[PDB]
Amino acid sequence: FSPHQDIISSRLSTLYQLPTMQRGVLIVPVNTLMQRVCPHSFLHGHALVMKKGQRLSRDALRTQLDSAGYRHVDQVMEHGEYATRGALLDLFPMGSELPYRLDFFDDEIDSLRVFDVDSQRTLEEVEAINLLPAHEFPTDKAAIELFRSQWRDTFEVKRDPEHIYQQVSKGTLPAGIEYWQPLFFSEPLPPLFS
Amino acid sequence: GNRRIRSVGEMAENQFRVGLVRVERAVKERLSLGDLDTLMPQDMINAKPI
Amino acid sequence: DRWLELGLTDEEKQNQLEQLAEQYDELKHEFEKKLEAKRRKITQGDDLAP
Amino acid sequence: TLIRNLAELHIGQPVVHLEHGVGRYAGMTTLEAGGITGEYLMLTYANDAKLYVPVSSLHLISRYAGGAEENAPLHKLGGDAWSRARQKAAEKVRDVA
Amino acid sequence: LVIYEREAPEGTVKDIKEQEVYMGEIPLMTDNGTFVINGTERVIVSQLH
Amino acid sequence: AGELLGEEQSGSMETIGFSLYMELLENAVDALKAGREPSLEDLTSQQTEVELRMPSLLPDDFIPDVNTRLSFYKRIASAKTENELEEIKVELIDRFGLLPDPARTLLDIARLRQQAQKLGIRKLEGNEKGGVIEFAEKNHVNPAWLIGLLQKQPQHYRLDGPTRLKFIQDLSERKTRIEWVRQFMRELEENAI
C-alpha cells in the first residue's frame, strides 16, 4: 500500500526547507532515519513559484503540472490533484495544506485565492504560491524509460498485465510502487545526512 | 446523354426503401392508436417485410 | 522458446521487442480460440428443408 | 462520512424508476429532441434497451435498497411484472391506510 | 421512440426510450464482385434506363 | 432489508424500495385527511410547470462532474424563496466563475416558478408566437381588471376555457420572451386580490 500520500505532504515541506534554517528542533525516530531519501536536486530543481504579474498560459501551466506529476481530477479534495472548469483552474499544492484557485485572465494570473475543501469559495487571496513535485520521484517519460532500463538490468521481466514493470510502462502507478524508489535516479540515494 | 446506368447499389437501395415504406405505414397506424405508455420499438417493427 | 527477454540497450529497439512479444502472445490466443470456433462449426447439426 | 461517501450516482449501481422498473444508471447526455437541447439521465434495462428521462423529472427516481447490487432484478422494459408488483403494493398500502 | 406530453404545448418530452431493433439481412459482395445467395453465386448486371 | 411494512425483516425478497412506501403512505394519508378515493396519481405529481420552449440546462462544460450537477439540480428544483436563488447564484459564481446563458435562464425560470406558486397560477406555457396562462382553483387575480384587459385587447387576449387565457406575442428573442412574461406576471400580481 502507498504511504498515504497526505502524509507525504507534511514530509516534503520539511525536506524542502531543511537545509535553510537556523533555529528549530526536528525530531525523527531511528526507524525512519534508517530510510534513504531523495537528492534534493530533484526537489529544488522542480520548485515552481506562481506570481500575480505573470503572462503564463493556462495550458502551458497545465502541462507543467502534468510533468510535475499532479493528477488530473474534477472534484479536488486531496493532496496533489488539479481540476479545470472553463477559465478557472484549481489545484492543491503538495507543500501547503489548502488548495487554490487562479482565475486566469488573458493568460495572466489575475487571482490566487485559497478555498476550503467544502466552502469552494474565496477565503483570501495571497500574492504568490510555491509548489513542489507531486511525489518523491519523477514521473516524466525520461523517468519511465530510466526505470525500465534499471528494471531490465536488474530483475527479469514477465509479460503480464499486472506485473509492475508493465503496469508502470503503461503510465499508471502501482499501489506500493513507492518501495521501488531507487529505480528512478541512477544514483546511490543520500542517507539524509547531507 | 439521356440514358442512365443504374448499377447494383442503387437498385438494391431502392428495393430496400420500398421495403421500409411498408413498416413505416404499419408503425404510423400503430402510433395513431393510444396506449403508448408501454410500447417498444420491437413489436411495431417487423423483420419479415424488409 | 527463450529469446524474447534477452537484454538490450535502452532505445526504441526494446519497444519493438516488447511489441513483437505481445504480438506472439496475441497470436497464440487467436489460434487457440479459432480452433474452438472451427470445432463448433463442424460438429453442430445442419439446417434443412422440412 | 460513510453515508456521504455516496448516496447516488455510481456509474454501475442500480436505481428504480417507479414508472417502469429497476435499471442501472449510466450517466447524463444532452439531446436535441424537438429543437431544444435538454439534459437527460439515462438508465439501462434488460436486453440493452436504454431509457433517457428528462432531468427536470428527477423526483421519479429512487435509490435501490433491495440489497442485490450484484444480483438485482433487471426488469425488461415494457412488461407487466412491474405493474403487477405495484398493484400488489398499492393494495397493501390501502389496507394499512 | 420519443413520447411527448399531451397537455403541455407542442414540443416537450415526458420520457424517451430506445433500443437496437433487428431488421433484415442484406447479402454481401465477395471480393470479386459476385453475390452468394444459395451456394449458387450470382451477379447483378447494370441497367440502362 | 426486509418488509418495511410487513413482517419477516432482513429479507431479500423483490419488494419495492423504501421511499416509495412512504410516498404511498402519505398519498393514502391524503386519501384519509381529505377523504378522497385511493388513486395512483399523487405519485404523478405536478406542482407548477412553466415550460416555454427555451433551452435551459447546466452544461457539462460549465460543471465537469455529474454528482454536483445533480445536487444543484435538486436544490434549485426545491427552492423556496428568491434569497435561496440569490445565494445559489453567488455560490455558482464562486465555484465556476461566470454564468452561461442557459444557467441564467434556469435560475430566472426557477424564480418565476417560485413567484407564480406564490401568486396562485399553476401552468404557464408558451412558444415564440404566444402562449397560455392557467390559474388554480382559488386564484388571486382581480377578475374586474382581468375582464378589463380581456376587453381592452380581445385580439391579443382570449379567455378560452374556465382557467385558460391565450395571448399572442412576437417573442423571437429569448430575452424578449422572458422580460415580457416577467412584466406580465408582475403587473398581474400588482392588482392581486
PDB file of C-alpha atoms in Angstrom, chain F residues 13-184:
ATOM      1  CA  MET F  13     -37.451 -10.524  -1.453  1.00  0.00           C
ATOM      2  CA  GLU F  14     -38.319  -8.407  -4.507  1.00  0.00           C
ATOM      3  CA  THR F  15     -40.191  -5.685  -2.627  1.00  0.00           C
ATOM      4  CA  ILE F  16     -40.426  -2.116  -3.899  1.00  0.00           C
ATOM      5  CA  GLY F  17     -37.785   0.193  -2.443  1.00  0.00           C
ATOM      6  CA  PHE F  18     -38.032   2.242   0.746  1.00  0.00           C
ATOM      7  CA  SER F  19     -39.123   5.731  -0.247  1.00  0.00           C
ATOM      8  CA  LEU F  20     -41.989   4.628  -2.483  1.00  0.00           C
ATOM      9  CA  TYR F  21     -43.627   3.100   0.583  1.00  0.00           C
ATOM     10  CA  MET F  22     -43.561   6.497   2.286  1.00  0.00           C
ATOM     11  CA  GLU F  23     -44.864   8.137  -0.891  1.00  0.00           C
ATOM     12  CA  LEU F  24     -47.861   5.808  -0.954  1.00  0.00           C
ATOM     13  CA  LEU F  25     -48.327   6.175   2.809  1.00  0.00           C
ATOM     14  CA  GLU F  26     -48.564   9.957   2.558  1.00  0.00           C
ATOM     15  CA  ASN F  27     -50.798   9.623  -0.507  1.00  0.00           C
ATOM     16  CA  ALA F  28     -53.162   7.410   1.482  1.00  0.00           C
ATOM     17  CA  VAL F  29     -52.927   9.864   4.381  1.00  0.00           C
ATOM     18  CA  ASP F  30     -54.211  12.419   1.887  1.00  0.00           C
ATOM     19  CA  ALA F  31     -56.927   9.910   0.987  1.00  0.00           C
ATOM     20  CA  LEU F  32     -57.853   9.884   4.702  1.00  0.00           C
ATOM     21  CA  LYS F  33     -57.474  13.563   5.631  1.00  0.00           C
ATOM     22  CA  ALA F  34     -59.343  14.732   2.527  1.00  0.00           C
ATOM     23  CA  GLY F  35     -61.389  11.528   2.483  1.00  0.00           C
ATOM     24  CA  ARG F  36     -60.555  11.224  -1.211  1.00  0.00           C
ATOM     25  CA  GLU F  37     -60.563   7.932  -3.069  1.00  0.00           C
ATOM     26  CA  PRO F  38     -57.306   5.952  -3.212  1.00  0.00           C
ATOM     27  CA  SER F  39     -55.544   6.570  -6.507  1.00  0.00           C
ATOM     28  CA  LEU F  40     -52.094   6.042  -8.030  1.00  0.00           C
ATOM     29  CA  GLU F  41     -51.905   9.659  -9.204  1.00  0.00           C
ATOM     30  CA  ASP F  42     -50.289  11.587  -6.335  1.00  0.00           C
ATOM     31  CA  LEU F  43     -47.025   9.998  -7.471  1.00  0.00           C
ATOM     32  CA  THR F  44     -47.703  11.604 -10.867  1.00  0.00           C
ATOM     33  CA  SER F  45     -47.351  14.972  -9.168  1.00  0.00           C
ATOM     34  CA  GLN F  46     -47.184  18.426 -10.741  1.00  0.00           C
ATOM     35  CA  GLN F  47     -46.533  21.433  -8.512  1.00  0.00           C
ATOM     36  CA  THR F  48     -46.028  24.021 -11.263  1.00  0.00           C
ATOM     37  CA  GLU F  49     -44.936  23.728 -14.898  1.00  0.00           C
ATOM     38  CA  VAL F  50     -43.520  26.822 -16.593  1.00  0.00           C
ATOM     39  CA  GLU F  51     -42.020  25.330 -19.745  1.00  0.00           C
ATOM     40  CA  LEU F  52     -41.673  27.904 -22.516  1.00  0.00           C
ATOM     41  CA  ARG F  53     -39.698  26.168 -25.306  1.00  0.00           C
ATOM     42  CA  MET F  54     -36.369  27.706 -24.368  1.00  0.00           C
ATOM     43  CA  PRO F  55     -33.160  25.727 -23.691  1.00  0.00           C
ATOM     44  CA  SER F  56     -32.242  25.685 -20.012  1.00  0.00           C
ATOM     45  CA  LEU F  57     -29.636  23.351 -18.530  1.00  0.00           C
ATOM     46  CA  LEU F  58     -26.365  23.281 -16.632  1.00  0.00           C
ATOM     47  CA  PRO F  59     -23.877  22.473 -19.418  1.00  0.00           C
ATOM     48  CA  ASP F  60     -21.271  19.856 -18.590  1.00  0.00           C
ATOM     49  CA  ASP F  61     -18.564  22.251 -19.763  1.00  0.00           C
ATOM     50  CA  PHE F  62     -19.678  24.622 -17.005  1.00  0.00           C
ATOM     51  CA  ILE F  63     -19.528  21.841 -14.393  1.00  0.00           C
ATOM     52  CA  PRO F  64     -17.397  18.739 -15.099  1.00  0.00           C
ATOM     53  CA  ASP F  65     -18.791  16.052 -12.810  1.00  0.00           C
ATOM     54  CA  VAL F  66     -22.374  14.764 -12.659  1.00  0.00           C
ATOM     55  CA  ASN F  67     -22.872  14.330  -8.929  1.00  0.00           C
ATOM     56  CA  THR F  68     -22.547  18.048  -8.206  1.00  0.00           C
ATOM     57  CA  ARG F  69     -24.690  18.889 -11.227  1.00  0.00           C
ATOM     58  CA  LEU F  70     -27.490  16.684  -9.934  1.00  0.00           C
ATOM     59  CA  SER F  71     -27.136  18.063  -6.410  1.00  0.00           C
ATOM     60  CA  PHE F  72     -27.612  21.605  -7.686  1.00  0.00           C
ATOM     61  CA  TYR F  73     -30.463  20.446  -9.925  1.00  0.00           C
ATOM     62  CA  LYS F  74     -32.300  19.064  -6.902  1.00  0.00           C
ATOM     63  CA  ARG F  75     -31.573  22.121  -4.774  1.00  0.00           C
ATOM     64  CA  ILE F  76     -32.804  24.528  -7.452  1.00  0.00           C
ATOM     65  CA  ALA F  77     -35.885  22.384  -8.027  1.00  0.00           C
ATOM     66  CA  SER F  78     -36.674  22.559  -4.294  1.00  0.00           C
ATOM     67  CA  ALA F  79     -36.134  26.307  -3.892  1.00  0.00           C
ATOM     68  CA  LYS F  80     -38.498  28.254  -1.644  1.00  0.00           C
ATOM     69  CA  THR F  81     -37.503  31.941  -1.728  1.00  0.00           C
ATOM     70  CA  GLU F  82     -35.613  34.252  -4.057  1.00  0.00           C
ATOM     71  CA  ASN F  83     -32.975  34.607  -1.334  1.00  0.00           C
ATOM     72  CA  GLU F  84     -32.190  30.938  -1.927  1.00  0.00           C
ATOM     73  CA  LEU F  85     -31.786  31.705  -5.626  1.00  0.00           C
ATOM     74  CA  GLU F  86     -29.529  34.665  -4.846  1.00  0.00           C
ATOM     75  CA  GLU F  87     -27.212  32.659  -2.603  1.00  0.00           C
ATOM     76  CA  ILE F  88     -27.157  29.800  -5.121  1.00  0.00           C
ATOM     77  CA  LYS F  89     -26.160  32.292  -7.804  1.00  0.00           C
ATOM     78  CA  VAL F  90     -23.378  33.569  -5.546  1.00  0.00           C
ATOM     79  CA  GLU F  91     -22.152  30.020  -4.945  1.00  0.00           C
ATOM     80  CA  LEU F  92     -22.160  29.262  -8.670  1.00  0.00           C
ATOM     81  CA  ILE F  93     -20.237  32.487  -9.268  1.00  0.00           C
ATOM     82  CA  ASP F  94     -17.633  31.353  -6.750  1.00  0.00           C
ATOM     83  CA  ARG F  95     -17.316  27.710  -7.762  1.00  0.00           C
ATOM     84  CA  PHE F  96     -17.487  28.131 -11.547  1.00  0.00           C
ATOM     85  CA  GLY F  97     -16.926  31.819 -12.331  1.00  0.00           C
ATOM     86  CA  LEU F  98     -19.279  33.488 -14.789  1.00  0.00           C
ATOM     87  CA  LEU F  99     -22.751  32.140 -15.546  1.00  0.00           C
ATOM     88  CA  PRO F 100     -23.697  30.880 -19.032  1.00  0.00           C
ATOM     89  CA  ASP F 101     -26.929  31.998 -20.636  1.00  0.00           C
ATOM     90  CA  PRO F 102     -28.623  28.611 -20.037  1.00  0.00           C
ATOM     91  CA  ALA F 103     -27.658  28.866 -16.367  1.00  0.00           C
ATOM     92  CA  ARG F 104     -29.125  32.350 -16.039  1.00  0.00           C
ATOM     93  CA  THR F 105     -32.278  31.210 -17.820  1.00  0.00           C
ATOM     94  CA  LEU F 106     -32.662  28.242 -15.479  1.00  0.00           C
ATOM     95  CA  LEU F 107     -32.209  30.473 -12.440  1.00  0.00           C
ATOM     96  CA  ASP F 108     -34.779  33.014 -13.590  1.00  0.00           C
ATOM     97  CA  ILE F 109     -37.232  30.298 -14.659  1.00  0.00           C
ATOM     98  CA  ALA F 110     -36.983  28.823 -11.171  1.00  0.00           C
ATOM     99  CA  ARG F 111     -37.514  32.319  -9.770  1.00  0.00           C
ATOM    100  CA  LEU F 112     -40.600  32.820 -11.938  1.00  0.00           C
ATOM    101  CA  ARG F 113     -41.970  29.427 -10.914  1.00  0.00           C
ATOM    102  CA  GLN F 114     -41.440  30.459  -7.292  1.00  0.00           C
ATOM    103  CA  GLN F 115     -43.279  33.742  -7.824  1.00  0.00           C
ATOM    104  CA  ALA F 116     -46.093  32.038  -9.753  1.00  0.00           C
ATOM    105  CA  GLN F 117     -46.565  29.482  -6.984  1.00  0.00           C
ATOM    106  CA  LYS F 118     -46.755  32.404  -4.559  1.00  0.00           C
ATOM    107  CA  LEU F 119     -49.273  34.089  -6.868  1.00  0.00           C
ATOM    108  CA  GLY F 120     -51.705  31.226  -7.445  1.00  0.00           C
ATOM    109  CA  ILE F 121     -51.224  30.225 -11.093  1.00  0.00           C
ATOM    110  CA  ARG F 122     -50.294  26.624 -11.868  1.00  0.00           C
ATOM    111  CA  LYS F 123     -49.483  26.178 -15.575  1.00  0.00           C
ATOM    112  CA  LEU F 124     -47.833  28.936 -17.624  1.00  0.00           C
ATOM    113  CA  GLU F 125     -46.948  27.648 -21.090  1.00  0.00           C
ATOM    114  CA  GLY F 126     -45.922  29.298 -24.312  1.00  0.00           C
ATOM    115  CA  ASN F 127     -43.904  29.405 -27.504  1.00  0.00           C
ATOM    116  CA  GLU F 128     -42.439  32.076 -29.770  1.00  0.00           C
ATOM    117  CA  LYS F 129     -45.840  33.214 -31.067  1.00  0.00           C
ATOM    118  CA  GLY F 130     -47.683  33.483 -27.741  1.00  0.00           C
ATOM    119  CA  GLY F 131     -48.908  31.121 -25.074  1.00  0.00           C
ATOM    120  CA  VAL F 132     -51.457  30.243 -22.413  1.00  0.00           C
ATOM    121  CA  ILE F 133     -51.817  31.055 -18.721  1.00  0.00           C
ATOM    122  CA  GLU F 134     -53.736  28.687 -16.444  1.00  0.00           C
ATOM    123  CA  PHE F 135     -54.659  29.503 -12.849  1.00  0.00           C
ATOM    124  CA  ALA F 136     -55.525  27.370  -9.802  1.00  0.00           C
ATOM    125  CA  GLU F 137     -58.917  26.563  -8.295  1.00  0.00           C
ATOM    126  CA  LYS F 138     -58.665  29.577  -5.932  1.00  0.00           C
ATOM    127  CA  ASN F 139     -56.644  32.231  -7.746  1.00  0.00           C
ATOM    128  CA  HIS F 140     -55.747  35.715  -6.522  1.00  0.00           C
ATOM    129  CA  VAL F 141     -56.014  37.729  -9.742  1.00  0.00           C
ATOM    130  CA  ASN F 142     -58.576  40.526  -9.797  1.00  0.00           C
ATOM    131  CA  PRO F 143     -61.488  39.414 -12.033  1.00  0.00           C
ATOM    132  CA  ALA F 144     -62.580  43.005 -12.672  1.00  0.00           C
ATOM    133  CA  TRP F 145     -59.332  44.206 -14.235  1.00  0.00           C
ATOM    134  CA  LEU F 146     -58.879  40.726 -15.715  1.00  0.00           C
ATOM    135  CA  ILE F 147     -62.033  41.215 -17.789  1.00  0.00           C
ATOM    136  CA  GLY F 148     -60.923  44.799 -18.339  1.00  0.00           C
ATOM    137  CA  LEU F 149     -57.770  43.604 -20.087  1.00  0.00           C
ATOM    138  CA  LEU F 150     -59.764  40.893 -21.863  1.00  0.00           C
ATOM    139  CA  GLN F 151     -61.992  43.528 -23.463  1.00  0.00           C
ATOM    140  CA  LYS F 152     -59.118  46.007 -23.878  1.00  0.00           C
ATOM    141  CA  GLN F 153     -57.314  43.664 -26.287  1.00  0.00           C
ATOM    142  CA  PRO F 154     -59.503  40.645 -27.064  1.00  0.00           C
ATOM    143  CA  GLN F 155     -57.406  40.045 -30.180  1.00  0.00           C
ATOM    144  CA  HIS F 156     -54.262  39.768 -28.023  1.00  0.00           C
ATOM    145  CA  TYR F 157     -56.109  38.147 -25.096  1.00  0.00           C
ATOM    146  CA  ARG F 158     -58.812  35.467 -25.149  1.00  0.00           C
ATOM    147  CA  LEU F 159     -60.252  33.563 -22.193  1.00  0.00           C
ATOM    148  CA  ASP F 160     -60.607  30.200 -23.940  1.00  0.00           C
ATOM    149  CA  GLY F 161     -61.641  27.882 -21.130  1.00  0.00           C
ATOM    150  CA  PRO F 162     -62.622  28.247 -17.473  1.00  0.00           C
ATOM    151  CA  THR F 163     -58.999  28.920 -16.490  1.00  0.00           C
ATOM    152  CA  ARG F 164     -57.076  29.424 -19.758  1.00  0.00           C
ATOM    153  CA  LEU F 165     -56.000  32.805 -21.137  1.00  0.00           C
ATOM    154  CA  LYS F 166     -54.480  32.743 -24.629  1.00  0.00           C
ATOM    155  CA  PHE F 167     -52.180  35.567 -25.714  1.00  0.00           C
ATOM    156  CA  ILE F 168     -50.162  36.284 -28.858  1.00  0.00           C
ATOM    157  CA  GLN F 169     -46.666  37.759 -28.807  1.00  0.00           C
ATOM    158  CA  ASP F 170     -43.768  38.125 -31.248  1.00  0.00           C
ATOM    159  CA  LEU F 171     -41.088  36.992 -28.801  1.00  0.00           C
ATOM    160  CA  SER F 172     -38.464  35.789 -31.256  1.00  0.00           C
ATOM    161  CA  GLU F 173     -35.820  36.684 -28.649  1.00  0.00           C
ATOM    162  CA  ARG F 174     -35.462  34.596 -25.507  1.00  0.00           C
ATOM    163  CA  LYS F 175     -34.684  37.788 -23.596  1.00  0.00           C
ATOM    164  CA  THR F 176     -37.809  39.437 -25.003  1.00  0.00           C
ATOM    165  CA  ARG F 177     -39.898  36.398 -24.084  1.00  0.00           C
ATOM    166  CA  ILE F 178     -38.627  36.267 -20.509  1.00  0.00           C
ATOM    167  CA  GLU F 179     -38.957  40.018 -19.981  1.00  0.00           C
ATOM    168  CA  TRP F 180     -42.492  40.039 -21.388  1.00  0.00           C
ATOM    169  CA  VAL F 181     -43.605  37.190 -19.141  1.00  0.00           C
ATOM    170  CA  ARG F 182     -41.872  38.706 -16.105  1.00  0.00           C
ATOM    171  CA  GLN F 183     -43.542  42.083 -16.567  1.00  0.00           C
ATOM    172  CA  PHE F 184     -46.881  40.461 -17.402  1.00  0.00           C
TER     173      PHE F 184
END
